[PDB]
Amino acid sequence: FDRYYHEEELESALREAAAAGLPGLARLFSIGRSVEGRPLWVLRLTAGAAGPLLPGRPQVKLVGNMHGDETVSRQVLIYLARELAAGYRRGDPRLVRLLNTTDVYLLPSLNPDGFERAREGDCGFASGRDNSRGRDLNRSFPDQFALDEVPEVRALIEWIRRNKFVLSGNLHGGSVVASYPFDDSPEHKATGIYSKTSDDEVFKYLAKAYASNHPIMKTGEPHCPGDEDETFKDGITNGAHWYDVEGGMQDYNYVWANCFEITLELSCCKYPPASQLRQEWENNRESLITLIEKVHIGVKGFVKDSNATISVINHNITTGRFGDFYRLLVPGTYNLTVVLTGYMPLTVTNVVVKEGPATEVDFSL
Amino acid sequence: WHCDSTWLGDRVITTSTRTWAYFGYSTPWGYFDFNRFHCHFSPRDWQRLINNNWGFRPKRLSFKLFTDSEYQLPYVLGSAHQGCLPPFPADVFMIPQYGYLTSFYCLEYFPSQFTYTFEDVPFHSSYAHSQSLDRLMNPLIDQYLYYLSRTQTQTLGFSQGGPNTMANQAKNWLPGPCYRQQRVSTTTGQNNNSNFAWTAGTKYHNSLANPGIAMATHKDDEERFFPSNGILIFGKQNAARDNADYSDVMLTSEEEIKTTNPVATEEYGIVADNPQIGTVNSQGALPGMVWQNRDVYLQGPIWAKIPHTDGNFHPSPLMGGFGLKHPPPQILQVSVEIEWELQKENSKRWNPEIQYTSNYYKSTSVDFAVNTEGVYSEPRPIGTRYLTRNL
Amino acid sequence: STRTWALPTYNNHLYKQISNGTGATNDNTYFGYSTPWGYFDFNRFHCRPKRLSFKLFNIQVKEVTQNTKTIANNLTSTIQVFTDSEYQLPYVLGSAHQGCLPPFPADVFMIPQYGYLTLNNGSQAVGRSSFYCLEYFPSQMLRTGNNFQFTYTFEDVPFHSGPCYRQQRVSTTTSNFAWTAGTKYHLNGRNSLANPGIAMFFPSNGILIFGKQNAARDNADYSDVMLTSEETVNSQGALPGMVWQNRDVYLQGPIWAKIPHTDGNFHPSPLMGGFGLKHPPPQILIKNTPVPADPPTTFNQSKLNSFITQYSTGQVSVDFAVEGVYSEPRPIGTR
Amino acid sequence: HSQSLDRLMNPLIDQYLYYLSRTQTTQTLGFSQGGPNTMANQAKNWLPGEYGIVADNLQQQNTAPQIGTVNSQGALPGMVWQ
């Protein structure tokens, strides 16, 4: 399979992947329309518009082709949908438990207009980087440190606010590295400044989990034209530490939502020729799956009476419509305080996270 | 051997010397052709001409080595044929054979250096408008002319055309005529999965209307889309005779005239069918329309003979160039020296304009130069519309 | 025809980029510049032609102060006036804009601000976009004792006295189809209304509609406006043999328009009616010379931001009766 | 006229200008030089004074490129007639 699916093709390929699994598993919908009216196709995969939200299943999204000429993400997301469906039909136990315990959202192309304006063989050493209105989708989200001109960004924002995404990663091009959030800094210096989060180590762990499984990223050296041998230790990096980006989407995802997002630069050739795409799939498949599995780390549970805020780390998260909460954490002891307005709180301390599956706890307020 | 360009005042005299060797007839005669621009202009000279002039036109040529000075022979030039003087002076070219279509014209019936003087011809617009035809108004002052803006609360409402309702303002001119062309993407996957090169081609009854009337290649942010047969497509060096790959050819882009001319792939506009609406795909000449001609290129034809018909409308060649009632006569070591009258630009624009420049970054071989094996190549078709004017 | 004019300080002596992208659908997107200059327009008939003489005299430049609005003559202040006789500026005249000389001589009118448009991709400019600094022109400066004057000679334009582009049928004897069912032309993916289109109970947008005195800027009722009347194949281009008339000129309509400098045009007569001129009367640009307030006593590299609030009056030379309000009851045709 | 408007070229010499000759191999983009054999596809400078065929729609991957017959045609640049 080596073909760049364009408009229409996208929907056809996504629905072919949906039919490539059991019925009732996949739902392909649109979170909005681009400037030219191209739908923003999103495929939802889970056992059982977007349909009802299943209990005990964290929401995971992977928004690719967010820059128009960074299109390895688009094809690897399409192949990820196809592989998930094929594994679910074939009885792939790993993918079976993944789909049973995770509500995976895949967004192959956030900027279809820019993808259409992209030209084959352009490695990016404009080429459709912006939407058809000329605005960058990565420089349009509200910076923590006009929506009408970016309908794709507004649609993504509404989709995020309508859900309770736990783990996510947007996939990019032009390098091979996993950059974790706070993509900018208050000083807004070009490079060099380290901008850590309250969950800096958790984001480091997620970036490590993706990078170590990537054949190129695990080396920590993209070794690509116009890079000055910019060696990223461990294959991971911080946002402002790599280069300044004002209004990045992962920063909004972290600050304005419960989402934990890491930008994944899969390849340094932005629009590789079709022949290489197969290789790109084998370069990313496992890592992608790995990232989804990493949603099952930390603490998970429900808050029930006998939108509750969970506090650990100056980053609080809220519960879902079912009261479920998922806080991504690494092994160790944490002090979880649950606070609901009008419900006098509960500080359950000594919550111990073990490596692998997330720790369970049910709160009665 | 005279081969150089002398720039004197508003004139440029370019001389070039080269070494040389349906029903109709094929004569044994060979004909001399120098109807391509690169036969006279070096890429440096073409850059110098197009970066500093709002127009140019030939004045007179001198050709030294019979000629059909009365044009009694079928004028075969101007059909964009091969056999032209090579762009590279060191190249030795073979004289193309002379043949015509139909009337037997025996060439030795004619009696066998010379100088020809070009008739007064309009300057070629070596500029692209900095204003759009629908944006000639003042973006600060409303119009005193009202337009019907409302029809139901069923009622009748009129509004003054202003900066916000800019598309509703009354206007004095219309875009050029349209003869709609089928749209083809350079991104191949975006096209239909059928061979519609001929079946869906825009043709006149069934000769193909290639390249048709001068219309913009694409609108904004659509450089991948081009009219199916509405643009000039030049051949890259050592391109295939037929069935050439897209990377083996160079497509010209006429979007510089998108500010006055309609897009070649899109309709001219909407009229009233009866409240049904009809879409006009082909639009003839209307009062008040203005349109730019097709751009000339360093590789493109220079002139073409206007057919000796009873009438014509805007007799400018559809391939670009200068429409001449009496073009340079057919000529049945060679030095051709042509003089061009330049139109010097007088622009008060503050910001710098767009000039043609060679890419700074490293290249394996210099563009518009010879490669390792001594083969001269033109890497891209250099346009002529780089400076800017106002409508 | 002599009128008393007043010119204020536009944009605080600032050239301002203006833009409008996508309400404000793509057909209404524009990019351009608003200049601190006003311009003189006498392109309406109530303000063939052979020549004109333009004079600009009796200039008073008055500074206004607020505390108490006190207006005092500034005898040493100048105004810059120039005519782009080489047509090097975007010719915004001929677009039927307001700010022209009033039909009634006794009226004192406000000089419209000069702004121009340029190539745009939405609210966003392109490389071919041109920025014109009107201060980059030789402009004559005038104090209270100076007068400006020039003369212009019209070229040989034909005397003022069929191809088809079908319009929509609209009845004055009453869905909203003004824009949807209107007759428009497509240009660069921007549907622009063909008003009044080629010369042809009125068509949807194929006529000139003037406004009576005290008429709403938008959604004006039919009784508040005056329609002009010029009494299968739907679009017919020029064929060999058809003859047609031009749209009539009116006492309130435009006089001329600039034929765009283009490779080709067909019957270059303005669609609004009037005279198509390759070199129309040059647009006359007039501005109050900026008069700074007191700068600090320590040098500052930044441009001066505090100016004296100032304006300038002067005289300009180049039914149907008056609470002192002059009105034109009906549009007067020529034929 | 002893010549027709679409036969003003050389029946012996190929053109240096290419035209889109192939679109489907799957999808592709093939270009060919106008020649004596493919003389109708060859580039011209003039048009006649069913006038011809134009494109009605904008072809996409699924929309077939339907065409339209021009029964009445107005004046166009580079159009000659007797």
Next chain:
Amino acid sequence: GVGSSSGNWHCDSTWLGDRVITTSTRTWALPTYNNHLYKQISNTNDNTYFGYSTPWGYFDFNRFHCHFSPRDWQRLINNNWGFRPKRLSFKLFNIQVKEVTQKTIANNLTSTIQVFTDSEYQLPYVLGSAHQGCLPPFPADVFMIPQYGYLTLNNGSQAVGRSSFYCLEYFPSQMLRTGNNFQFTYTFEDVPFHSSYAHSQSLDRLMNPLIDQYLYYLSFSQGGPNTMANQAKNWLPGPCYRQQRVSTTTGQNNNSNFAWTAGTKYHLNGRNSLANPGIAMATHKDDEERFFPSNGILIFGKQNAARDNADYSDVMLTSEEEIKTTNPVATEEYGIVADIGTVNSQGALPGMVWQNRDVYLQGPIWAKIPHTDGNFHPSPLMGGFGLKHPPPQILIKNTPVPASKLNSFITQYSTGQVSVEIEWELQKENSKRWNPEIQYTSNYYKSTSVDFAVNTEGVYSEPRPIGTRYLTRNL
């Protein structure tokens, strides 16, 4: 006449043959400096000075954008091998003198302003030091006249016996009311053309790459196409004064504040001064655009850039890479001699050639050659034309109007229009080069605002520093 304008607005550029006449008019405001007083000013040992601040303002048009519009600059650099100023006419007209009181402003018709030109160069020449206060790049901008002040010999923050005090009121000056105008014409001396070109051949590659040499070198072998670094050569690269290499990629620099401690400077009067920008040398070698000499380049400021501690994004670096064909790289040694040793600061040697520093649209135009016994290549190091008799300083002051010497004066400022019209001579570009040259062009792609144009708030900004060397010549 109070009610009649003294002059008109002349902003234009006439391109006639090999001459370009650029005239530019601006609106200026001159306040009362130092309250009509000459004030002695004085001040680490490297930054010590003594001098006088005068109540006089001076007109500055030493920046190229004061006369050349960006389109004019493009037209000049894209078509000409060189240019030099030929003459200038300076006019000062439409003068208003106003008094502000506690607050309102009123015309003072009877008040005068003193304007003169230091045509005999008897005053300290403060122009050519790349100071602010020049005519604005944008004609619509109204500018403040900079205050005149000069320095003198100092021993720390104290004067010496040879310290010179200059009373600018001792000069003959023309007094102008609202009806008067000032004007003078100055003729530039014979100055070499500024090289508005970049060499298309490197100095070490001037030989025929097909024919061997008849001169042998100690290998013994003959210089040939293969071993070409060994061929006999007639010329050497220009002199070098090595600079510290700083990477725009801030992660590639040392983690120390070496800007002053490790910067390249010269020692004079026991007082180290930064050799900025130093002698003309290549900013970097090829494929090394991220490196620049620590203080060996001209660094202009973007619009709204901070005066102190402006980040790299707020400034624009100028690169002298186009003289890498002849000038040795600033950050890298001149060569290797025997003792082997590495030569870092090389003086002038017979047979060496070197290109001068480029001039920029935002950069200086000229500088006064100091009146010294000797000088080697008297060309300004920041670029431009070295003039023994440059355009004279035009000093302007508001004549005090009093309200022991009188101390209280009427708080008074002045405004007016200033026109400078410079005629420059051009070198026509006459090259047989076949491939197209490199021209300066604006970016074609869509941009939120037009470069070298006003923004939505009415602020004119120059996005990048436009060089001057775009066309090519052979060595």
Next chain:
Amino acid sequence: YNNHLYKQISNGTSATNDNTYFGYSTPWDSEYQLPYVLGSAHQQYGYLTLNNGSQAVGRSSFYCLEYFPVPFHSGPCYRQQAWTAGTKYHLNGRNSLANPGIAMPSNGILITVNSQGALPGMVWQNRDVYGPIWAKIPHTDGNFHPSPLMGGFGLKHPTFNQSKLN
């Protein structure tokens, strides 16, 4: 020469950096518009231009030659001493041997301070002539004593087919 062809010639690392070049070999000038190759003491016309390795830059010029119609001859120091220890100068990351160098050795003849530039009041002689006669002074803004270091006089002005026939 070259079978009447202009052949692009070059040399990169895949020799050494100091010997990299790019230019054109022609099959072969009163205004001095061609690259002046005389004065380099050579034993066919070919010229060099700007290069970055074996490949040219955008500033490189291609010249088609078919596109064409002092004081009487009788001390600064740059110390001399085969290649590693040789006295060489540096220009654009390319060590070039300073042979013969300034007139006064490993590369100093025609076959403490060690490098002293010009100072006021110091005198020197030019290298003798045996040998080259003249050399073109490069057209440059500045030059100090523009004499040829190799010796001589520094002169400021010293069936049809479209394919080309083979």
Next chain:
Amino acid sequence: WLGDRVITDWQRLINNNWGFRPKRTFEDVPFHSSYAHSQSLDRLMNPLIDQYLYYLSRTQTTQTLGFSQGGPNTMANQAKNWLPGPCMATHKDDESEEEIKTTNPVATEEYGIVADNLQQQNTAPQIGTVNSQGALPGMVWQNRDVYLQGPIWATDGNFHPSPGGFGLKHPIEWELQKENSKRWNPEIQYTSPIGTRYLTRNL
């Protein structure tokens, strides 16, 4: 003493003239600068107006890249058009050819500091003190003063052929250069080895 000519006293010559040169028949020799500069080469700028040119001033916030405008306070960091003479003044302040300390570097001390190595993340920048500096473009200097007891006058190529004294290709009436200076404060005169630089000029 007749106008600009004197036919041969030393005090009168040095106290009232900017330069002098022998006439007879001497060839045209440049006027010997009999004046000490009233301005120093590093202090030719306006002490009230900042420079529009920026200079690197800051490298540690970690690693940063900071630029500042040359001003009256950061005066040594300002961009300058000229360099001192090659390395010549006898001594610096409070330590005879001292009149030329404004333009010529001190003889007993270095010309300046250049960069020695090429810095990276791991190599600290190194400095090299230049002791013998040759001719550089844009550098200016004064000649050694003549004295009442000193000498008057004294190849294929030479650089600035000045002895102290007059550099004559072919080695008494002296043409003088009348001082025309609007210096306000009284000048320094010789009063009772007699130097020659007593009057002052600007650079």
